Amino acid sequence: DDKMDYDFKVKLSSERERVEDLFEYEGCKVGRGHVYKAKRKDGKDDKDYALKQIEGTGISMSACREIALLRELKHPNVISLQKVFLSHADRKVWLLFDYAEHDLWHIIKFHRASKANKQLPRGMVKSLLYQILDGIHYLHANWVLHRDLKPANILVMGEGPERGRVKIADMGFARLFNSPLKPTFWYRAPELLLGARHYTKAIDIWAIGCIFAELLTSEPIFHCRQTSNPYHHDQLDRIFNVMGFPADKDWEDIKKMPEHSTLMKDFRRNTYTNCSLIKYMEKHKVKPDSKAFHLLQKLLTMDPIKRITSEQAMQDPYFLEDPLPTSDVFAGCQIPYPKREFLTEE
């Protein structure tokens, strides 16, 4: 600005840390949902860092809220913002995080592919679920919803001081009026599909239920093929094929859901009479009398008010049954999952 003090302006400019001075990231793009795997340029760490360049320019509402909340949130199972760079020339924003080598999308994909080349370790499954719940419990206790939980967002740290620790990432930090109706459906709770007007803690817990099933079987439990409207017929059909159609007593307030009459129009209870979570999970070699299953069923409760909370899930006797969950989900064993490849595509 012309009316800004010149001395003030040049002092700040002289002192301002620039992302390109501190970090080597060119050619090191790993993702774009622009995410880079970066090393420090001085060579004082040799640690890997994740640099996220925020999409757009300036500071949007979504960028503001993301910076706002990450700046406060501190917990071992939630991804931790190290530093923010404000690039004054191009008005671009960069976020620095510790680098998580793995995630559940890739880990599960690796096991699903290994099944073809003929299961996920059960101590690992439990430990992952425990840490996901711990991190989500922390967010929820602070009235922060994730609003977009899926395997790609459950990161897992590689070799280093936090080996095998879960890091929840990529929270949906801005949703206009906390609304799903404003601009994959596999991890979406049935109330969202029937037109729920707000995100809730319960919606996050359903997604954890979905992830947990997927870790146990290597298959997305509510897998389905790929608008403004919340009602998705094929996704609901898949839920009922797995779960059965809910009885009136299972979800009394279903009648209040905005899409209830559409549900009645398109679906018949009779269609799903041979369908249940018990039957589904048995086919995938998970016993219905297992503590794992009983907890899974409490997470995948259809009526959101009857869904277990994160804190209650952490207290489940499943976590007291042998084997105990471990802080490193790999339990000191060798990590077979491949590292992320650098992308060279234009």
Place this chain on the structure above:
Amino acid sequence: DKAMAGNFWQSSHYLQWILDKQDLLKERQKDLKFLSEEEYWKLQIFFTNVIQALGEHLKLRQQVIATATVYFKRFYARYSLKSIDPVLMAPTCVFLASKVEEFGVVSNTRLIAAATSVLKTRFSYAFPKEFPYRMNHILECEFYLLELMDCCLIVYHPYRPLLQYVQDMGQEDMLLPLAWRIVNDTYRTDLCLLYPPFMIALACLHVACVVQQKDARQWFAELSVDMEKILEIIRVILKLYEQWKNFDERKEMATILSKMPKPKPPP
């Protein structure tokens, strides 16, 4: 928005933005070469009122206006009034604070229109000329503000604990409107930079009880708090109202604004 509600003790507000009073006074000495101490606190009152008016024009809720006010105070707690024009900083603070919320957005045209309209209709005693800044200036200023604040955007305020305290008294109808109003008035001072918000709430509630002749002494005794620090806050509130009485901002602010140190231009 209850995001981070019970996290004050591990918050950036508490760990980074509760300042030492002597560090505040030391940094203020550079602007005290131009303005007296009286004139400096009068300027603070003026820009608190400017921010309030901008927020009311944009129909923002009190808590958003308070956050914006805290941003403004944090900036000038570190930096001279010459560094960035406070006329530019004030709407920039409101704009940034509104973006921390996800319930509605403040557009560019609406922000500038609001700055233009509020200064000409409510502050022409201080500003004969039209609001000269365009949206590119706001966006530039926003980057400087965010940098100075070390990206600390979540701000806690006395409104939430006040509401809890009065509901605990069973005296919401009698005491809340006055106590709330007094909380608004504390932003005319440095209190928000110096004390946890719940302590400021307790002080405002005390003053409200004294003004309305309500005996709440036993209720205050039932709390586990440092009442010395509460009394410190009470004294600043009582002083604020005497300052208010003796200050005519409408007659004085044009002259006071002319004494503000002016930005060094480029060479």
